[PDB]
Symmetry: D2
Subunit: 334 residues, 4 copies
């Protein structure tokens, strides 16, 4: 998966992510209303009551709602991303703390924090444990990213040596390795710019670019996590500032399109295709949730604040996996 | 610009392209009805009567309709793409032939040919001339690509040494240099595949990939024409076969998303941003035209065959440059 | 193999090449004296008498001396390099011409031409034929490069469509594909320069290079022919001008060291290691021949003009495959 | 600078490095005899008496001999390399320790340690201080590498957060960033191998490599520290094992030839050329020191054990900057 956040000229903060997996567990957009309550562990019945209502993409297949990404009524934004080979979970909670299933971090954090600091604070009383879940059959290796209404972003990584916290980062996050490795990697590519190389000569031969684009020489085009990090960061740097929230959603989806994996281009060892199942964007100030999926490029929006945040039940929105083509005249839908 | 064509499992042929420019001349989807008549030169009043009706993206700003890409009522598909530094036009027609403005080639070819061979034949009686047009102020450097209802693709390049014709090619085409250069370039990148490298050791150190995606090590991620060529070709090779025309349109748009330029990431010497203004797909057998634009990811369709092909007038469809977000609940449209 | 030619500030022309093969046929530096006579075909006994004496690296394993590279008494320089998949030879000579084994072109050219034009001229009366030789068991796919005392360089390629001649080229040549393909490829890499990228920022993050070298971002480091072409050309462009012939030899060996293959880093499909068996340099005005080999980094020189160019016999110099370490004190030679 | 160590099949350990700088301070090979005594600080007169004799490349321009690299009479090998932007030194020694000039670490370590553990131990009583020297005018940013007679290698980095120690590493070291960053970077390149990609097809087009070499697709050919790290590591992995010490010296120099910078190809911001001034190799068991310099490819050897290790004075060997060409016949030395 890939992810980044931007700031509009409107003083709006937006966060966006791609979901790249080999299978599509039933997911839908879920609204979790205040005081719905969320499990901490799937094999323990302790339920923490959630102070805030929140909206995002998740699963309803286990006891409490599982959120992949989402926005708060308070403006906090966040998402779970894979962190293969690096994510390390303990067997029992560290002394004092309570254990938490890695898969419930977003729902817990979104239901209860306002700022990035709130998030850092809330996690000191928890210990991520190696508890599996019946959807994947194991506890997925994950790292986490959160963005405030203010635009401050953090990265929390459950490393071998313990939780590593990254404060006020560049607002870009994909997969392994660790945030510091990626941020140091940016330095080797500072020469990837929007501008063309000057023409040169080789003896009497005039050498000029094939057309436009040659400032990017060096950016990798493959779909590895590191390559995707570079592409989201550099294109985040250079694409124009969003003037408002709508420009923001469409700019965010443009940047992520450079890291959008078509089915069949990436296969696992297992031979499974790793592709971009969906792409979402969130706005902290409006609390709106936007998304497009593999089979439908039409963006769909759900407003959190439009619902009753004290409803007893979860308010869900199903995916429309058909391509929403608009017919200008009578097309033959085929 | 970038362009490719695929074959569905349905026996359907589709062609798609991106339009990358620094400015948006008024363009709309235009239907040109049979016997509408098309100029050959803008400074001469000879009008060739077109046998076939056709639909595509173009301009109505000069005497006859200018088409950028399009489909026929016969199934022929084609498009004009830039060919900077390579395109060469004569001053006067070669002996016997009539001169043609390079900007009118698609309209003429689409109004009158059925097969790729018809196209090759029709051009032997013409000479592309250096006639400017009032939209750009000059005659743009261009090369052309055409795809039959059968799926056979050709490339026509107005080179220094004359028209170069490429028969039954891989069905990919971006910008300069010449088709043969890019097709040879593919060979250097045959190791870019979907599958992960085996793990290795360095003494006692175990080395394994950061996650998925490493088979692509080597593919360039910049927006140069050569880089874009490679990306469209390799991803055309590895994304899954379209099972029908709709999968075909969405698969085409996925492949091209790897060569979609966000505003600001490519600047000319002039400092102008070169970006993907629109993206279109065509189906030879259905004669349907699909498109999305920069500011709207919702695909829109026009059917050629749904209109009266003997209308006297042009049937046009305007662009909707607003992001067509579908509201699932009452979003606040902002 | 890789090859290039430079011009000193002394008005000296030098040519150098690496020999990359999977096996070392007995080769030695050979002096061919005037009027020694060279076969044209190995299965025909016609012997062309050679007007000029010449020196270079070759084999004495077949009827006439086979030269891989070399200099004349006239200052003409040249070498045979592999051109796999591209080199095409006829079965019978074209009408009029006499057939020539591709393996005897350098000996013939060096024994009889003075300028690059003489070379182009002399080849019009010959047809390269598919005649094998008992060393390789087949006729190797080859292309040729020649450099005048003036410093004018050409490239002769026996293509499918016939001999292709490249006049006054950039003075670089490796393997396939064709000279024009590589010369065009230079244009995609004009941004590879000696100078560092300007520092940039990402929000509040200062991004700066790891150290020196970043102007080269984009140059490929692998040992493919195309990559080696780029490396020799770009490093030829930016390494300092040779002030004299000795600087020339060492500058030439420095440039080629970036395309020097250590045993084990490149294997064929056969699993054979492709490595740099030797590296040579020639000076047109002095007619000196320099060489180093895999196992000895000490450069060895032979002067052509120092021998009797009317000798009846070949004057040969054997390879010293031991590393010629100079002992400053009593080292223990182990 | 670049550096690596290998193990022969002879049970010999060898270490080698390139010296890449913009200027050549007078350097020569220096033998430091036992009990010669080495300063710790240049502005303090405390002299630590050195237990062991050692040989390497260094400067005699300040109070005590400055060594860049070298071997012991005990078999310990090591070198100083730049670590720009990362190296951090204190103003005053930490409580208990004595201050040491970063430029004297090799001399001190080589004169007093046997194993990599001895090295780690010895440094716990010192604090690297920001003391300049009259040669550069400042305290150069450096990191250190050491290799035992056993073949165990470590990396010591004076980081912002304190000395960072890397135990039993892969035996490769160039410049910034930190050792762990480079070791993680290896993982993105595990697909760079000696073996050719399988041939593929694009429709009916057969696609095959230009020749040999395509398994390396992905390796960068630029001279940045990161790119040089990769090249030394991957080529260290795949070049054949040294069967004895001489093969070891020549294999070492072959691997480092991929990271050998010709004058003119890298320029600083200042416009100064950063080039490979010299290249050296050391063998732990024989205590032999080997070197070649920019202008002479002939390897020169000094044996430590051949001198009197109790001499009162330094035993020095000057550089021969002329290219040591061996004349096979009477060449004209020009």
């Amino acid at each position: 998966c890939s992810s980044l956040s931007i700031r509009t000229t409107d003083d709006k903060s937006l966060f966006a992510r791609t979901m790249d997996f080999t299978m599509e567990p039933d997911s839908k957009v879920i609204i979790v209303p205040r005081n719905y309550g969320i499990r901490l562990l799937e094999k323990e019945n302790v339920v923490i009551n959630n102070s805030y209502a929140f909206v995002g993409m998740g699963s309803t297949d286990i006891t409490s709602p599982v959120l992949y990404d989402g926005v708060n009524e308070k403006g906090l934004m966040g998402a779970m991303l894979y962190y293969a080979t690096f994510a390390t979970y303990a067997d029992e909670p560290k002394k004092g703390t309570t254990g938490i299933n890695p898969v419930y971090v977003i729902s817990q954090v979104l239901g209860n924090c306002v700022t990035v600091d709130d998030v850092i604070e809330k996690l000191t009383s928890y210990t991520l444990l190696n508890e599996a879940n019946i959807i994947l059959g194991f506890a997925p290796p994950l790292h986490y990213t959160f963005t405030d209404a203010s635009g401050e972003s953090i990265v929390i990584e459950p490393d071998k040596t313990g939780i590593t916290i990254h404060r006020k980062t560049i607002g870009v996050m994909t997969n392994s390795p660790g945030y510091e490795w990626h941020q140091t990697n940016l330095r080797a590519y500072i020469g990837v710019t929007p501008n063309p190389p000057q023409d040169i000569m080789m003896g009497d031969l005039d050498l000029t670019p094939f057309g436009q684009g040659a400032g990017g020489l060096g950016l990798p085009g493959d779909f590895t996590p590191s390559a995707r990090f570079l592409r989201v960061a550099y294109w985040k740097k250079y694409t124009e500032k969003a003037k408002n929230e709508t420009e923001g959603v469409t700019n965010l989806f443009h940047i992520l399109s450079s890291v959008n994996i078509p089915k069949g281009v990436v296969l696992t060892n297992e031979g499974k295709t790793d592709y971009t199942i969906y792409t979402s964007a969130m706005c902290a100030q409006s609390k709106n949730y936007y998304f497009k999926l593999y089979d439908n490029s039409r963006i769909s929006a759900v407003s959190l604040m439009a619902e009753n945040l004290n409803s007893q039940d979860l308010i869900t929105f199903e995916w429309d996996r058909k391509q929403d083509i608009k017919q200008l005249n009578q097309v033959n839908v085929m």
